[PDB]
Amino acid sequence: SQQTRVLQEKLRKLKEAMLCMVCCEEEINSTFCPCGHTVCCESCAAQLQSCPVCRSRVEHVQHVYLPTHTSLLNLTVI
Amino acid sequence: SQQTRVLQEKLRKLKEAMLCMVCCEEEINSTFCPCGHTVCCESCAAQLQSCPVCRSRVEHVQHVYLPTHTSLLNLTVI
Ligand SMILES: [Zn+2]
Ligand SMILES: [Zn+2]
Ligand SMILES: [Zn+2]
Ligand SMILES: [Zn+2]
């Protein structure tokens, strides 16, 4: 149904938005500090001296737990 | 259908997960440091001496821009 398709798309897009913008594989779990952009996994974040979104200097990387990381989700990556 | 109900429930819960766990009004936009739990708006986070998830002392609150903002915008209606 249209209803199921649209809902499935919204869920798909949310899950994709939780993936690292560099490797597109690992979940985002790192915040660039001070700027606050939260777009990389730890391994990809480690290779950046400036934020890829805003180009602010990265003073340090803070580990984070995205609030949408839930066992409710099936978080398959093809 | 059962699947449509299932998707609605997942998405409803994910929407709540993107909103502050205290005030339930504002998108999460802060991380407790050092622990990394990312569950409150800055306003609520500022008033907490210990993490509401893990009870770690809060040394600092870091502003964060969650990568799931677009998804939250598109869940105003589920
Ligand atoms: Zn990565
Ligand atoms: Zn930035
Ligand atoms: Zn709040
Ligand atoms: Zn914590």
Swiss-Prot record, chains A, B:
Location of the protein in the cell: Cytoplasm; Cell membrane
Induction comment from the UniProt entry of this chain: Expression is directly activated by NR1H2 and NR1H3. Expression is not dependent of the sterol-response element-binding proteins (SREBPs). Expression is indirectly induced by LDL.
Location of the region described as Critical for homodimerization in the Swiss-Prot/TrEMBL record: 64-66
Highest taxon, organism lineage: Eukaryota
Tissue: Ubiquitously expressed.
Post-translational modification: Autoubiquitinated.
Phenotypic consequence of L48E: Inhibits LDLR degradation
Zn finger intervals (RING-type): 20-55
Functional note: E3 ubiquitin-protein ligase that mediates ubiquitination and subsequent proteasomal degradation of myosin regulatory light chain (MRLC), LDLR, VLDLR and LRP8. Activity depends on E2 enzymes of the UBE2D family. Proteasomal degradation of MRLC leads to inhibit neurite outgrowth in presence of NGF by counteracting the stabilization of MRLC by saposin-like protein (CNPY2/MSAP) and reducing CNPY2-stimulated neurite outgrowth. Acts as a sterol-dependent inhibitor of cellular cholesterol uptake by mediating ubiquitination and subsequent degradation of LDLR.
Entry comment, domain topic: The RING domain mediates ubiquitination and the neurite outgrowth inhibitory activity.
Subunit and interaction comment: Homodimer. Interacts with the E2 ubiquitin-conjugating enzyme, UBE2D1 (via RING-type zinc finger). Interacts with myosin regulatory light chain (MRLC) and TMEM4.
Protein name: E3 ubiquitin-protein ligase MYLIP
Upper taxonomic lineage: Eukaryota, Metazoa, Chordata, Craniata, Vertebrata
Covered residues, full protein: 369 to 445 of 445
